[PDB]
């Protein structure tokens, strides 16, 4: 992150050991379950590109995913280079936002200019776009193969369904179609008749409380 | 949270890795047992809507509950848009208080205005109203199903009763009726004999003192 020093200058604060142990444990345990992206974004709050790179470089496993993330960052930086041509600091190229061609002092310069050039947030968006693609890919089940077992509590099936629906991250019109049609269609023969009796106007609290005894 | 910087300006204090790890553990271990809501409220003191969202987005399990929570927050935000018609910074719409259409800088602007519009606390009320519904629904038994076993110590039955009564979270008239009438009525015949012998004026301390060995 960045802070103002006692001398009034803009000064770096390193990403702490505790934040890195948290991030590493999160990625190694949760293996790009979707919570990795909110937890990245939370631990990353205020990060310069050097701090973001420090988080990503410290990940150990999943080196397949880390190369797919690098490829996403590289193509996002190429789109930045294309939409924002080159003609206070120099205006950053995409490689500067990614923190490959820029010093930490340039990054803090841009992030404290007036108006700011928020290279930390821009790069964090490119990282999260890469993680979105990875989290979609690492989803083990497609939503179409989430089905309720003959004796499975409806609440457990709904949890499996919405966790898959979150990971697979379709567009909202398709999530609406899936939650309305598939959640009914893939329910077991007991819950499915219970849920049909509610009609198409069935909110999730209504569906779950209707099935609550089954 | 929000903090006064060295320059005296109002500045975001990031929700720490340990607070998030605590919240994530609390939700995923305690599965919307009622102590989850006071723990949430305690962990999110002074939280901006961006903080309150980093907390809710980092919850990985219970995605059925998180959809019920999202639906509740949307209902509260639509109600806010109704009860507060549209016309210091602009007056926040419901989606602004939810942090879905407001920056962290707008949130700090509202939360540190004079007088403040405390969008963090307003949004946390909507979150807690959603968690109240979730904690009610995740209750494993109605209070009318809580009854004492022939060999069950009265203290353990009271613990089951009041944990259920806390989850059911009826109005205080109804809790009074339940604790006066149902707690005795649902006790086993020996405890029920002692508890009738005390008469209806006995406090819970007398009820447990008299039944202590039954």
């Amino acid at each position: 992150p960045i802070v103002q020093n006692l001398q009034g200058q803009m000064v770096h604060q390193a990403i702490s050991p505790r934040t890195l142990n948290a991030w590493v444990k999160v990625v190694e345990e949760k293996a790009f379950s979707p919570e990795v992206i909110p937890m990245f974004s939370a631990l990353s709050e205020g990060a310069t590109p050097q701090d973001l790179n420090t988080m990503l470089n410290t990940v150990g496993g999943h080196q397949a995913a880390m190369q797919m993330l690098k490829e996403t960052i590289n193509e996002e930086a190429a789109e930045w280079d294309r939409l924002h041509p080159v003609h206070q600091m120099r205006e950053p190229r995409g490689s500067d936002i990614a923190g490959t061609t820029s010093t930490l002092q340039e990054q803090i310069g841009w992030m404290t200019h007036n108006p700011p050039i928020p290279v930390g947030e821009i790069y964090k968006r490119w990282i999260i776009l890469g993680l979105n693609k990875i989290v979609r890919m690492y989803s083990p089940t497609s939503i179409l193969d989430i089905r309720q077992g003959p004796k499975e509590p409806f609440r457990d099936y709904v949890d499996r369904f919405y966790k898959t629906l979150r990971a697979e991250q379709a567009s909202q019109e398709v999530k609406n179609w899936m939650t309305e049609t598939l959640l009914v269609q893939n329910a077991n023969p007991d819950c499915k008749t219970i849920l049909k009796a509610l009609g198409p106007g069935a909110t999730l609290e209504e569906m779950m409380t209707a099935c609550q005894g089954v | 949270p929000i903090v006064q910087n060295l320059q005296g300006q109002m500045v975001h204090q990031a929700i720490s890795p340990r607070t998030l790890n605590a919240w994530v553990k609390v939700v995923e271990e305690k599965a919307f047992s009622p102590e989850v809501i006071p723990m949430f409220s305690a962990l999110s003191e002074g939280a901006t809507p961006q903080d309150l969202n980093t907390m809710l987005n980092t919850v990985g399990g219970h995605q059925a509950a998180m959809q019920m929570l999202k639906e509740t927050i949307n209902e509260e935000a639509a109600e806010w848009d109704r009860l507060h018609p549209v016309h210091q910074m602009r007056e926040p719409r419901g989606s602004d208080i939810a942090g879905t259409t407001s920056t962290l800088q707008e949130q700090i602007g509202w939360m540190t205005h004079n007088p403040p519009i405390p969008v963090g606390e307003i949004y946390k009320r909507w979150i807690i109203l959603g968690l109240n519904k979730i904690v009610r629904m995740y209750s494993p038994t109605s209070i009318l199903d809580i009854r004492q076993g022939p060999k069950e110590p009265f203290r353990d039955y009271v613990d089951r009763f009041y944990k259920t009564l806390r989850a059911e979270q009826a109005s205080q008239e109804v809790k009074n009726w339940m604790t006066e009438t149902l707690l005795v009525q649902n006790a086993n015949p020996d405890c029920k004999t002692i508890l009738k012998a005390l008469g209806p004026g006995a406090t819970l301390e007398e009820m447990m003192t008299a039944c202590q060995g039954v």
Partner: peptide, 11 residues
């Protein structure tokens, strides 16, 4: 492109 995994807030 994938829609993103945030349930609450602005994604």
């Amino acid at each position: 492109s994938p829609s993103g995994v945030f349930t609450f807030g602005a994604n």
